[PDB]
Design a binder for this molecule. Sequence first.
Ligand code: HEM
Ligand code: HEM
Ligand code: HEM
Ligand code: HEM
Ligand SMILES: O=C1C[C@@H](c2c[nH]c3ccc(F)cc23)C(=O)N1
Ligand SMILES: O=C1C[C@@H](c2c[nH]c3ccc(F)cc23)C(=O)N1
Ligand SMILES: O=C1C[C@@H](c2c[nH]c3ccc(F)cc23)C(=O)N1
Ligand SMILES: O=C1C[C@@H](c2c[nH]c3ccc(F)cc23)C(=O)N1
Ligand SMILES: O=C1C[C@@H](c2c[nH]c3ccc(F)cc23)C(=O)N1
Ligand SMILES: O=C1C[C@@H](c2c[nH]c3ccc(F)cc23)C(=O)N1
Ligand SMILES: O=C1C[C@@H](c2c[nH]c3ccc(F)cc23)C(=O)N1
Ligand SMILES: O=C1C[C@@H](c2c[nH]c3ccc(F)cc23)C(=O)N1
Lengths: 351, 342, 332, 347
Amino acid sequence: GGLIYGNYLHLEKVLNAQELQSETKGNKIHDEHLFIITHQAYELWFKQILWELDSVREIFQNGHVRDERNMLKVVSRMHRVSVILKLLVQQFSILETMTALDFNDFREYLSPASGFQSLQFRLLENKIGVLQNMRVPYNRRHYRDNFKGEENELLLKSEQEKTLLELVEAWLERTPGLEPHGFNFWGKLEKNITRGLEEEFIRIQAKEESEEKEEQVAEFQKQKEVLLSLFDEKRHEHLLSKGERRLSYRALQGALMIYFYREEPRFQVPFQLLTSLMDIDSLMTKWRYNHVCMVHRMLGSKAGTGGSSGYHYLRSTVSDRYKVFVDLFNLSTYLIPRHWIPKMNPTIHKF
Amino acid sequence: GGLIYGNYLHLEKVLNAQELQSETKGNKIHDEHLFIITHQAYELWFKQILWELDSVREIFQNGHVRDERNMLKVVSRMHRVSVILKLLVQQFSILETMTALDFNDFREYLSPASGFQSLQFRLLENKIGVLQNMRVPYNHYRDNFKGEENELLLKSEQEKTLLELVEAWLERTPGLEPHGFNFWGKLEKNITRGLEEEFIRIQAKEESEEKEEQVAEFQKQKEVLLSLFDEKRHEHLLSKGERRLSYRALQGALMIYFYREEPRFQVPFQLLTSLMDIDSLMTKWRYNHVCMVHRMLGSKAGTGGSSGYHYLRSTVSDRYKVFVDLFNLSTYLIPRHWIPKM
Amino acid sequence: GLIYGNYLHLEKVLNAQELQSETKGNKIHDEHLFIITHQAYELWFKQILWELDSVREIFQNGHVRDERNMLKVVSRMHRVSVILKLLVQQFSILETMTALDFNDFREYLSPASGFQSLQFRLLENKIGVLQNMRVPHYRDNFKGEENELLLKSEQEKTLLELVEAWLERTPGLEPHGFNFWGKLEKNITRGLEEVAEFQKQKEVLLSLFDEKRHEHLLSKGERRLSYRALQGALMIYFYREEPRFQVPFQLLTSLMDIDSLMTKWRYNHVCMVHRMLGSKAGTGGSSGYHYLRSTVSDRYKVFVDLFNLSTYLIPRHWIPKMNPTIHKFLEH
Amino acid sequence: GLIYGNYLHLEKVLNAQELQSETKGNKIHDEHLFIITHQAYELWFKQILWELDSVREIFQNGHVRDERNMLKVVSRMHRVSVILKLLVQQFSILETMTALDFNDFREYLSPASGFQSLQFRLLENKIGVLQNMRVPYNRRHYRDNFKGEENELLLKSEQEKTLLELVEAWLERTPGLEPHGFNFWGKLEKNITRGLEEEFIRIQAKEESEEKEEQVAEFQKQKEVLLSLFDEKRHEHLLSKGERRLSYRALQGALMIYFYREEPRFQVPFQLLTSLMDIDSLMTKWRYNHVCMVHRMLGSKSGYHYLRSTVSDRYKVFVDLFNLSTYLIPRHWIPKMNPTIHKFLEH
Ligand code: HEM
Ligand code: HEM
Ligand code: HEM
Ligand code: HEM
Ligand SMILES: O=C1C[C@@H](c2c[nH]c3ccc(F)cc23)C(=O)N1
Ligand SMILES: O=C1C[C@@H](c2c[nH]c3ccc(F)cc23)C(=O)N1
Ligand SMILES: O=C1C[C@@H](c2c[nH]c3ccc(F)cc23)C(=O)N1
Ligand SMILES: O=C1C[C@@H](c2c[nH]c3ccc(F)cc23)C(=O)N1
Ligand SMILES: O=C1C[C@@H](c2c[nH]c3ccc(F)cc23)C(=O)N1
Ligand SMILES: O=C1C[C@@H](c2c[nH]c3ccc(F)cc23)C(=O)N1
Ligand SMILES: O=C1C[C@@H](c2c[nH]c3ccc(F)cc23)C(=O)N1
Ligand SMILES: O=C1C[C@@H](c2c[nH]c3ccc(F)cc23)C(=O)N1
């Protein structure tokens, strides 16, 4: 038998998977078909994100990431995950063609099932690196309870196996130029920022004791506290513990090296990767936020079939507490004028 | 005990349908998984579009459309189809993150299967109203099918298309009755008069090569607007497949255009706009498919037999535009003052 | 003969790009993108004001009472939605600028900011955002003729108010007519008989008829519509298929759409500002990021009532049966 | 203090809206949408020219030789394709104007058209649309509709080095092409010759079947196309026919970057070639969405027949980059890299 489209794509499974509970309980509602197909498409795309994501995790875990041939493939697959999520954010607009009233006519046949029971959404959160600590109080206790057997087993492995956060952290820690014996990035930077701020305090104190200056002297003192707190490793470990940061002090230094020196040939694709990790975080959140806006129109204030407050619980998930790579965002707090960036000498350029 | 998300959605089926031919032949190629999911996603949405479309056909076929209570349901479902198609056009962006080089690594394992074997794509084309005899020469499309599937295509070819059902509904548009509002006779009279006057204002002007441009413009207009009232011409053009709608449906469509602000016509106007939307997005679908296949194959021939790129280009024409007549009513728009007063 | 460039006054549009970075002697390439992005946002804000004002004027001059105008109204409201969808997508362009590169010309913007966009505020005011519900005055940014326009835009009737009046005159609320409200209270009460969530579900439904609770929540600002407007809204939801209700229901749908898309614009702005500045202060004085997060809330959802009515949805067999008489009144 | 409105010069941008219907005493509401839409497009064409000129410059002044500039080049080419995506999306706004409403102000616009957009022509020229290959309108050149300085600026844009010419030059210096070096081309012919021979043996070994009759017709087709690629004389011929645009040597660089894209020196260059095809594809979707809208607005009123001509490979400047997918070969035929050339493609 020569290969046929329908058989290749196992459409005898995919297109024989649509059972309107409304029809099964004798009262067919038209739009329930849309409800099912929308979720099934979301779930196809989750599996494909998981396929890309597990493949990039494997390239870090098995050391292939160490060979820089593999960086185009890493960035290309991670960018693919953001392109898919973009589509998933847009996909909400299809289900927004269902009125709250028409939803109401079949809602009742759904209890107590809910999106909460999405295994693959949880595999996706975990594998990226959402920690138990990060999860909203209701979310934390209640998320893994919905599961049993092999489904319970996959969820554990997703919590226990190396997350994309951990693997990126290890890789960032080996960023070339951090070696105190070599380029000594962190040392040179602390020196240049200290030198840099001293020049700034002198520029400001040289002005005629006015109120435009008084604005500058106190804006300086805030900027100085902040820039110098970069070098306070104990503040890092303290912020690590309140989970306001997630990355090792040294990964942070790696990420900042990649940012400042991103044009150097060996950092070009590494910079692209860091941008794609922020994009995935931004789009995961835009997904959460587009989900909230739609549930508001569908339920108003009413409790969800899963037994949550509904619209309010979901609103609490749209928070930086769920941004895994929140640190890559927060590095923008520590941007300095280009003039203060430790200059590169011919030795480390060729490197 | 109680309904579980996974069970409701039959994810035991949906998420166990992903078999890489490259893996089955012991040379697993990563990007093959994307190829499969992308098509599985397209096919879920094709099934939803058929669901909405068949529901709208039945509302015309069983006379429920006669009861104007049901027009919000009709327009909202036809709008929903165009919203889904917007997503399917955007959806090519995902598959375009596969390089041609990466595609080249699993392409051999697909032979001789292809999109020509999409039952649902063909069912959708037929149910809207793509005729067997208007398909570009190389498409003979149904030979790619056998068995139960092949029967369904013929039910789809012989059962009443959206085009036929909208034609019948257009033929009953209120205002067309020669003893009533007599739209057609009044429109002919007002265009004939409006033109006569328009020509008087040209023979005022001082003979020049500017006045000759007006006379030349006027003669082109006159011929086009007056040809609207040539029924023998419409029947000739129907038979050549340059028009699809009966002469009387065309009159009903023009009535809906001119008088759209009249409450009874507001939603019917939204319906005609949606039908044109759906043709526009189908053709955007064919064009985005074409643009991607060019990057993937070049001028190489398809696994499904055809020349690939060049053949698919040919499917991006008004040959495949079911509601072409609704686009071409723009050709016969006239100044407001000429529209018969209500 | 008319020429494209002159029709479009391109001599102004394409001579409006001045890089402040270039003016102070070190041109930064990416500033040109920052300028053009803001200019296109402002062109589109103007087009939304033009649509919105024309719909305001169609309620205020009485024409909305002529139902042949409903197509124009829902079509112009729909158009504002399509423009807002593009304005949300348009952040994707400015996100091709890295924080690093932004950082190179940001110094020259001090102290200008979005807070000084007149059109954004006119738009917020004209839809019906109340200044007493804003997270902190915004007018302190504005002076001269701009402070005037802005003042007019709070005092002149908002889209919410005009939509309110219109919802208040909705066919079927008349107590000695179809008496929608009385029959609904009869019908919710007659159905509420049958781990039971029923006790919670009965408590919330029946508080719909508590005209007093509404009065309190309204003055407080957690609700925005008159009690009677909210009756009209719910009338149009339940009887949306009735010929006369179809395009009015499309209008309510598109009003919620505009709230969603404003909030989506607010949230996309936030996501981009987060990558651009981090937890830095904004050039206009505020703790940029955390303040912009506060604008993404129901304080700023003008038509929150139309959203919240999903709470009070009932099975259809409870909805007051519509007799052959009022079926006749709601035909064309 | 700098003020938002002054910074953006809004005193120009938001005082550039003159409805011609209104300045002839019959104001039509939708004419405003028409004007804003075009003005948004023109703002964005100006951004695309800003990006595209900086990139041409980077090539022209020899800075692109310094590979630390590749992140900037590929960022600005990707940005152009991101802008062009929104411009394609932008047509949906104008599609909310009905043909009936458009018809109320159409008369006031004569004889102006999109044909008169200076920036759209510069954009076409600077990317590298050849005037010799453009479909004529009314049997005449596209520069007829422009005079004075605008006519002069279009002429410069035809004569100055196009993005195509500057990519072509850089494609010609692709490392690995040196006959005395890695000798990519010679090695490729050798590996393709062997590949086809090895393939012809496994087929002639199969039983005389439907497959055997078929695979010999297909194999003989694939054979003609692949050996086609080494025919430098055919290529020079197709250059002049305009059916190909890049020099034979540039073609070689492009194919080298495809096959060895994972090589670090080749990662970002492959991303650039991917972006060039992206821009061609999005310019053509621009042309097609414009057409689909004009069909609805005008019908057969013949502009709509010229516009369907522009949706053609005449206007696809990097058509060669697409067509290379014709000459793709199994992974294992690609000439291997050794530690003398592998180490020359390490950053
Ligand atoms: C009318 C449509 C929808 C409604 C009313 C809705 C409602 C809800 C509600 C109320 C919750 C909170 C848990 C609960 O009370 O049950 C929830 C969570 C969730 N929904 Fe939806 N939903 C809708 C559509 C979708 C769609 C299309 C998806 C696609 C996969 C989805 C995926 C999820 C997921 C994964 C969660 C768990 C979120 C988390 O804990 O962070 N929902 N939904
Ligand atoms: C990504 C690489 C893809 C390639 C290389 C490709 C190639 C082709 C080719 C060559 C044909 C013409 C028949 C033949 O000679 O085989 C075709 C037709 C078709 N393809 Fe694709 N395709 C791709 C993706 C897709 C996707 C994602 C869909 C989604 C449904 C799709 C649906 C179809 C359909 C329905 C047809 C029949 C088109 C018609 O006759 O009008 N293809 N494709
Ligand atoms: C890199 C890009 C951008 C950054 C970093 C940025 C940053 C900020 C910040 C920090 C604020 C808070 C006020 C302040 O401190 O000045 C703000 C407010 C604002 N921005 Fe932006 N912005 C950006 C782009 C845009 C664009 C493209 C628009 C388009 C109109 C815009 C419109 C606004 C408006 C209207 C406000 C006031 C809005 C409100 O009060 O909710 N911004 N922006
Ligand atoms: C109602 C909307 C539109 C109509 C009816 C329309 C119609 C046309 C027509 C008929 C032509 C061919 C020249 C002629 O015969 O006058 C044309 C060309 C053109 N239009 Fe449009 N157009 C529309 C919107 C737009 C928009 C929004 C743009 C944005 C810049 C635009 C840009 C162009 C350009 C650049 C050309 C020349 C294209 C080429 O030569 O390949 N048009 N248009
Ligand atoms: O090739 C390498 C060097 C090292 C590495 C870790 N992080 C990095 C970040 C940027 C960079 F350029 C190199 C590295 C690694 O393990 N693989
Ligand atoms: O009001 C509701 C409905 C339910 C829900 C959302 N998405 C789903 C998908 C499948 C399913 F079975 C149920 C649901 C939920 O979470 N609250
Ligand atoms: O209600 C109706 C009347 C009639 C009809 C046919 N075409 C129409 C077009 C517009 C309109 F308002 C009504 C009609 C029909 O069969 N159903
Ligand atoms: O060159 C090709 C590849 C093939 C193809 C496209 N889409 C598919 C989907 C399923 C399948 F099995 C094969 C295909 C086709 O039609 N021409
Ligand atoms: O002719 C009319 C009817 C009335 C009206 C007010 N609100 C409504 C809401 C729905 C509806 F169908 C009609 C109305 C109005 O102001 N003029
Ligand atoms: O950090 C910043 C930069 C500034 C800003 C945003 N958009 C603008 C537009 C024009 C302008 F001049 C300045 C701005 C702001 O609000 N916070
Ligand atoms: O660094 C270099 C090498 C050379 C070059 C030309 N084309 C290329 C294409 C890819 C590549 F990696 C390098 C090159 C150049 O002009 N400067
Ligand atoms: O019916 C028309 C109008 C004109 C056109 C298209 N875009 C424009 C923009 C500005 C302008 F003034 C005129 C036009 C054209 O080509 N055919």
